[PDB]
Amino acid sequence: TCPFYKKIPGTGFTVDAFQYGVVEGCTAYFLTHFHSDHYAGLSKHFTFPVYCSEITGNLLKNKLHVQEQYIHPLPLDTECIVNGVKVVLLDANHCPGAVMILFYLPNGTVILHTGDFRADPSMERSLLADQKVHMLYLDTTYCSPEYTFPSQQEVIRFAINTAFEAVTLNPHALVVCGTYSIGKEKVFLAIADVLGSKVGMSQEKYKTLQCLNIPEINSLITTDMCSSLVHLLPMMQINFKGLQSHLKKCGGKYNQILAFRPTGWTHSNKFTRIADVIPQTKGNISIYGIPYSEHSSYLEMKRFVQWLKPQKIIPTVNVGTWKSRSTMEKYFREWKLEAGY
Ligand code: NI
Numbered sequence: 001t002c003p004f005y006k007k008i009p010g011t012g013f014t015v016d017a018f019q020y021g022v023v024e025g026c027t028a029y030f031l032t033h034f035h036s037d038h039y040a041g042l043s044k045h046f047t048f049p050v051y052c053s054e055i056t057g058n059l060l061k062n063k064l065h066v067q068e069q070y071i072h073p074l075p076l077d078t079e080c081i082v083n084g085v086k087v088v089l090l091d092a093n094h095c096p097g098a099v100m101i102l103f104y105l106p107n108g109t110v111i112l113h114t115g116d117f118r119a120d121p122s123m124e125r126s127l128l129a130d131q132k133v134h135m136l137y138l139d140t141t142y143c144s145p146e147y148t149f150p151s152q153q154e155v156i157r158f159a160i161n162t163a164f165e166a167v168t169l170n171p172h173a174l175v176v177c178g179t180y181s182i183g184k185e186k187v188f189l190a191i192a193d194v195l196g197s198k199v200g201m202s203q204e205k206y207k208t209l210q211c212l213n214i215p216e217i218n219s220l221i222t223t224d225m226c227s228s229l230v231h232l233l234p235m236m237q238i239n240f241k242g243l244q245s246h247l248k249k250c251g252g253k254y255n256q257i258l259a260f261r262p263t264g265w266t267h268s269n270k271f272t273r274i275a276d277v278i279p280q281t282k283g284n285i286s287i288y289g290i291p292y293s294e295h296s297s298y299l300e301m302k303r304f305v306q307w308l309k310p311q312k313i314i315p316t317v318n319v320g321t322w323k324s325r326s327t328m329e330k331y332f333r334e335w336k337l338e339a340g341y
Helices: 054-062 121-125 152-169 185-194 203-210 239-247 298-308 322-339
Strands: 013-015 028-030 050-054 071-073 078-080 084-093 099-104 108-111 133-136 173-179 230-234 256-263 280-282 285-291 312-315
Touching: 050 054, 054 071, 054 203, 121 239, 121 298, 133 298, 152 173, 152 185, 152 256, 152 285, 173 185, 173 239, 185 230, 185 256, 230 239, 239 256, 239 285, 312 322
Parallel strands: 013 028, 028 050, 050 071, 108 133, 133 312, 173 230, 173 256, 256 285
Antiparallel strands: 078 084, 084 099, 099 108, 280 285
């Protein structure tokens, strides 16, 4: 049974609600992004209307085989009428194709559902500038002040400088980057660009990247592993055993691996600055955990909410424990008292 924080009142609509069977009263199912916790339940046998971005619709058709007649892509930043209700899709600054959804209810209420997002001051100059929001359905993944991490730009600067140094010292080093979902593609694209290489990967991952509308992608990636000195591997293989096993397969081309594991937040962010980050090393293998986040930091979240001044907030993450719920409610009241809304 579908929980309340996935239903949009006063509509026939649900958000990221595909794992509950046929939801009573649902005339259109929205999908904010192509991450498995959110699409859980979709397949080629789904027969209700799915509303989403163009890039999410390419993934639904090619990766999950949803039939074309049930896929309804909408452009971004454009007022659209769905089943008699005005909606707008906005870029979420999460993974490729990820959106927030603005719903303009028949009774005059305006609802924003953030999906998963990384808040940014640029969102203060989207179509959000123009009107009031009554209810905010908020991605609260990192809603606590202990959750600090650098800008994506600082993280990428570290990765490129680290990879370029290593390979210039040793032209026989291979660089490996872990992946398990879409998102964070700048990690492996920026490293391959500084090294003058395409990124090599499995047929299954190449297919996924081909659905993402990235400019000049055919110039940036390949399935010919022999031609590339940046390889992608499943995140589960990014360990000393997996990396040893990969280096064996490379036919004596390489004598060293430098690997990256993009994570979200980890508790080493409480102590160590990005610039001071060091790897774990065994022999000719070194692994860097880098804190590349596609969710808001606490401070980014706080800024966005204090600017938007919503009348009510409904969290969509960390909702399963009383302690998490109580913590989040306390921060929402602080933010409201501090800003005066
Ligand atoms: Ni996500």
